[PDB]
Amino acid sequence: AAEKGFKQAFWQPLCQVSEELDDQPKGALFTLQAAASKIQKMRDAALRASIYAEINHGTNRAKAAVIVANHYAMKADSGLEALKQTLSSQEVTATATASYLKGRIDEYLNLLLQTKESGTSGCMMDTSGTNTVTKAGGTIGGVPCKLQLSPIQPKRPAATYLGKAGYVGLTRQADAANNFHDNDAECRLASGHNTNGLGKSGQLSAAVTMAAGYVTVANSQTAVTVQALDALQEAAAHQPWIDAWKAKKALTGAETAEFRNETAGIAGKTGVTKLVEEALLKKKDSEASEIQTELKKYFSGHENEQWTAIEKLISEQPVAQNLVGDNQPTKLGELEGNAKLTTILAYYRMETAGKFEVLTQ
Amino acid sequence: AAEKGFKQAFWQPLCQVSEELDDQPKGALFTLQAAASKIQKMRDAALRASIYAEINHGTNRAKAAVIVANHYAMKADSGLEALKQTLSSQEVTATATASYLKGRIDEYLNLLLQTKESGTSGCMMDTSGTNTVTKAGGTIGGVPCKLQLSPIQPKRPAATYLGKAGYVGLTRQADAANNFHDNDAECRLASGHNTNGLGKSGQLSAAVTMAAGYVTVANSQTAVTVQALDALQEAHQPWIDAWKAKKALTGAETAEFRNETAGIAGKTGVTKLVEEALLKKKDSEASEIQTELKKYFSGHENEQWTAIEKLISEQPVAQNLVGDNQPTKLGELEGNAKLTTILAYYRMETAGKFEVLT
Amino acid sequence: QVQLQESGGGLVQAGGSLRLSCEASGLTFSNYAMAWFRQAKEREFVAGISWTGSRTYYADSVRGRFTTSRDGHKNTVYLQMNDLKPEDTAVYLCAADLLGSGKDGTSVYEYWGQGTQVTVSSHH
Amino acid sequence: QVQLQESLSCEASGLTFSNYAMAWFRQEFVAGISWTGSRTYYADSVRGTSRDGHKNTVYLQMNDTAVYLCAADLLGSGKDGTSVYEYWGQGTQ
Ligand SMILES: *[C@@H]1O[C@H](CO)[C@@H](O[C@@H]2O[C@H](CO)[C@@H](O[C@@H]3O[C@H](CO)[C@@H](O)[C@H](O[C@H]4O[C@H](CO)[C@@H](O)[C@H](O)[C@@H]4O)[C@@H]3O)[C@H](O)[C@H]2NC(C)=O)[C@H](O)[C@H]1NC(C)=O
Ligand SMILES: *[C@@H]1O[C@H](CO)[C@@H](O[C@@H]2O[C@H](CO)[C@@H](O[C@@H]3O[C@H](CO)[C@@H](O)[C@H](O[C@H]4O[C@H](CO)[C@@H](O)[C@H](O)[C@@H]4O)[C@@H]3O)[C@H](O)[C@H]2NC(C)=O)[C@H](O)[C@H]1NC(C)=O
Ligand code: NA
Ligand code: NA
């Protein structure tokens, strides 16, 4: 009946959304860290290739490794630019819009939870409309509904209650009077009229919305209405719901091309054709056949398999055992960490500088 | 008087906090972008130094340039690690805690704003208790209070209303009945008792807290009480969480992100590289490091580091690598991917020298 | 996901001009070379701009008739079509190539739009 | 807001602990540990320190009267010859 407290069909979908929004900051942290980690993996591969080229200087394999190093360094560079220009804003915006909406929802739900007169009459009722609900251990009537923002640790992004189309559980409600409102439970938050609702000497001036525009509480003796938010379009009285949906839909994760390796052959791999043109052919506009001829010299082919074969040689190359910890691995593919590999590269650059002096003086 | 609508002295301090929290995400975007920008500047310097070394093999300054390149590469590497491990969590946490608390505040304020019966009687009153207030642009009754999360662009946040000690405007209240509540305005949100408040057939069964625990609405015919939040220490936890997350922020200002102005031997990476690659010993005396540095830098002070950086910045690259009529000095070039491919060119030239020398 | 969205197509009379636009969403525009292809026949390269914006290339078929440009503030690449001919009727498709040269040749485009139809009429 | 606070234990706040060598001083260098956690160094005087990366803490198992200070050195060796500590604690007497 109009003007009565709200059964679980009304508030449980709001709890589900609230608990899912609580994971958006966790997913933002996961994605920002994943982007950095992937840049670091690109940089490690660039550094291993660079070190191989210094050790094996003056060979066709070393020239292949210069091409490999350039590829991976350009990927690391472009990934950092994408993290700066695109991912940071995507993830800050998703975190902020989700957390803001979660605060709007949680304040409303926490108000319903506390606005009760007894174990059988209040604003937040169980499934049947028999008892008011209570919060215990992060649940309300068994429903996960912490009504707090949890401590933030990285957690992989997911989507169940807020997805590409909208908020799955926030569907059109055709009979709020029977499915949302109880028959008996008293709740002045269910109405703006004065007899049973928020009005004192008379009705409120106008309808009142709550939970960032989700529910409309009329100033007359009639049931609430709710927005259907399951089929959203970019646009509102319920704008925070749209904002969080749009920001979440916009997320790519650390999964754009900068962050991923390529499997489309050598000439088309990032940086390769331009480096062959500029450093080997020393001409501005070459034909694909000329690129392929050069690649054959250094990779013995132009397919993924020949790139992988050079990468295996790089990975198998050992460094001097004094450059790593006692009893620690020395093959480049067994070493990781940017700062670690950077100083090994410096060692081999100084070896190259010294060998150059000996050979030319 | 108890059980009446709230005058502006009650809700305006909440608007001030809400407006300031709106900038916390702007500060997160600012700092994450600044960290990446600073890493990129370190990487550009590493690349310029590396290019100089590849070009000038045969001179002692080329070895100085290897040391310079290593220094900046290590700074870039460590900055990315700090962005990953430390700044990202700091800034996500500040964004989330501030935005969450702002949503709690704004839902409460927006309920007060709408819960009115006329132009002179409602839950959200002006300073004097004369008129109910209305939303007007980005204000409520003229007080900046958008009750929205604004579009995010990079900006450093103010710390006027949420600072190191707490929420400066949310002080202990000596007389809520007279200072927060009006004399006449009706407001069922001002108490939990049934005659004038939220109860229907009887009083609510307990006090109700609102705005993430800021205000406590008694279930009897009495004025609200509020938390003093101006002197915090590690039921109103969201206020604490936003305060601690904001004060924890360093910005992109830790050592990884800043250049060093002291001696050469104490610059990041330098002494270890001299020991490992030049002296080829696990331990060394400071004397010995200085002697090596003088061979390559002609000294060991910041002035000699600057002088090598000037040689690096003045070195031209081949015109075909930058385009017609474009600058050729390394110090006139910027952009990591741009400099990376120039380094690859000069590495290919080095390989061609060794192919004949060997 | 990343999206490249073309717009501006339609039914146009031969001899005049038409501007196509392609807006990239979800992507760092400044990292990518941007190109226009068209498909009636097999798909063919029309025009391209390098990732730096410094070099622009055209198919022989359109050189001197079409121009391309990019606006980094709007994440948009444009195709300015002039001297439209019946043989220009096609679906026009936008593509992005990471750190690319803004050519066809060996390039592998990581992202593609779904296209905008251009139909050039030579009747009245 | 970087802070090193001694209590022996030294906890680093606001800093990527794994980027820093950490050292103990006295008022002279007392002990130090490399950024990688693999090497240890001691003043002659004190001959005969540890770190927990999960707790952002460096320890000094003591088995001398001065204020003992904690210090961090970016990507440092763990010594005190030519190095320059970027962050300092307040000290524990
Ligand atoms: C893009 O692809 C490249 C090329 O595959 C990739 O770089 C490669 O990374 C892998 C994984 O780190 C390296 O594979 C090594 O292979 C050897 C021999 O099979 C293993 O022994 C290695 O494992 C040990 O060492 C690892 C650290 O390197 C440890 O994590 C592990 O516990 C073992 O102790 C390792 O699997 C390979 O050497 C490199 N190749 C090159 C040329 O650098 C790169 O990471 C990819 N980029 C992204 C973003 O994923
Ligand atoms: C840490 O410090 C390093 C070293 O200073 C710094 O790298 C330098 O970056 C600047 C760009 O910010 C490079 O270019 C210089 O920029 C300044 C400021 O715009 C200009 O004044 C300089 O112009 C002078 O020098 C030019 C070349 O010699 C001349 O053509 C010109 O007429 C001027 O005399 C210059 O363009 C500079 O090349 C680098 N240095 C090196 C060695 O790479 C780095 O960015 C700093 N890191 C951070 C995080 O800020
Ligand atoms: Na490509
Ligand atoms: Na230091």
Give C63→chain B minimum CA distance, Å: 22
Q: Which of B47, B61, B313 to mutate to test the pocket of ligand 2 (most atoms within 8 A of CB)?
A: B313
Any residues with CB less than 8 A from the CB of D83 and at least 6 apart, and which?
A: B266, B271, D21, D23, D73, D76, D77
Any residues with CB less than 8 A from the CB of B213 and at least 6 apart, and which?
A: B227, B235, B236, B237, B238, B239
Verify whether ligand 1 is closer than 6 Å to residue A261 (CB atom).
yes
Q: Which residue of A has its CA nearest to B39?
A: A80
- List the structure tokens of B213: 């625990």
Q: Report phi then psi at B119, rounded to 5.
A: -70, -10
Verify whether ligand 1 is closer than 6 Å to residue A311 (CB atom).
yes
Contacts of B89 in chain A (CB under 8 A): 29, 152
Asked if B344 and A69 count as a contact pair (C-beta separation under 8 A), the reply is yes
Resolution in A: 1.3
Contacts of B337 in chain C (CB under 8 A): 99
- List the structure tokens of B340: 């990376």
Residue ID of nearest Cα to ligand 2 atom 3 = B45
Pairing of strands A4-6, A181-186: antiparallel
First to last CA, chain B: 96
A17 vs A31: CA distance, rounded Å: 21
Residue ID of nearest Cα to ligand 2 atom 1 = B259
Q: CA angle, B178 as apex, B172 and B180 as ends, to 5°? A: 60
- List the structure tokens of C42: 């097999």
Any residues with CB less than 8 A from the CB of A177 and at least 6 apart, and which?
A: A1, A2, A223
Bridge partners (DSSP) of residue C68 are: C79
- List the structure tokens of B80: 């990315």
C51 vs A270: CA distance, rounded Å: 12
Method: X-ray
Nearest to B351 among A63, A116, A211 (CB): A63
CATH number of C3-121: 2.60.40.10
Q: Which of A78, A334, A336, A341 to mutate to test the pocket of ligand 1 (most atoms within 8 A of CB)?
A: A334
Give A208→chain B minimum CA distance, Å: 6
Asked if A299 and A307 count as a contact pair (C-beta separation under 8 A), the reply is yes
- List the structure tokens of B324: 């017609």
Q: Report phi then psi at B239, rounded to 5.
A: -65, -45
Pairing of strands C32-39, A135-136: unpaired
Residue-range domain boundaries for chain D: 3-88
Contacts of B262 in chain D (CB under 8 A): 84
Question: Cα A158 from chain centroid?
Answer: 9
Bridge partners (DSSP) of residue A226 are: A215
How many whole angstroms from A264 Cα to the centroid of ligand 1? 20
CATH number of D3-88: 2.60.40.10
Nearest to A165 by CA among A63, A74, A234, A251: A234
- List the structure tokens of B102: 């702002």
B222 vs B178: CA distance, rounded Å: 11
Cβ within 8 Å, pair A288-C106: yes
Cβ within 8 Å, pair B78-D81: no
Cβ within 8 Å, pair A273-C101: yes
- Cβ-Cβ pairs closer than 8 A, B with D, add up to 55
Verify whether ligand 1 is closer than 6 Å to residue A71 (CB atom).
no
Buried b (16+ CB within 10 A) or exposed e, C18-33: bebbbbbebbbbbbbb
Asked if A68 and B340 count as a contact pair (C-beta separation under 8 A), the reply is no
Say if B357 is an interface residue toward chain C (CB within 8 Å). Answer: no
Helix and strand numbers, DSSP H then E, in chain D:
0, 9
A116 vs A133: CA distance, rounded Å: 9
Torsion sign over Cα A319, A324, A325, A331: negative
Cβ within 8 Å, pair A78-C108: no
Verify whether ligand 2 is closer than 6 Å to residue B187 (CB atom).
no
B71 vs B49: CA distance, rounded Å: 10
Instruction: Reduce the secondary structure of chain C to three states and give it as a string.
Output: CCEEEEECCEEEECCCCEEEEEEEECCCHHHEEEEEEEECCCCEEEEEECCCCCCEEECCCCCCCEEEEEECCCCEEEEEECCCCHHHCEEEEEEEEECCCCCCCCCCCCEECCCEEEEEECCC
Q: How many Cα atoms sit within 13 Å of B153 on the Cβ side? A: 0
What Cα–Cα distance (Å) separates residue B345 from each residue in A271, B22, B252, B341? 12, 48, 33, 6
Cβ within 8 Å, pair B149-A243: yes
> Relative to the alpha carbon of A317, which ligand is closest?
1
Q: Report phi then psi at B260, rounded to 5.
A: -110, 140
Report the C-alpha dihedral over residues B34, B40, B42, B48, rounded to 10 degrees.
-150
Verify whether ligand 2 is closer than 6 Å to residue B267 (CB atom).
no
Nearest to B197 by CA among B188, B187, B184, B206: B188
Q: What is the DSSP string of A201-244?
A: SS--SS-EEETTTTEEE-SSSS--EE---SS-----TTHHHHHH
Nearest to B57 by CA among A52, A359, A17: A359
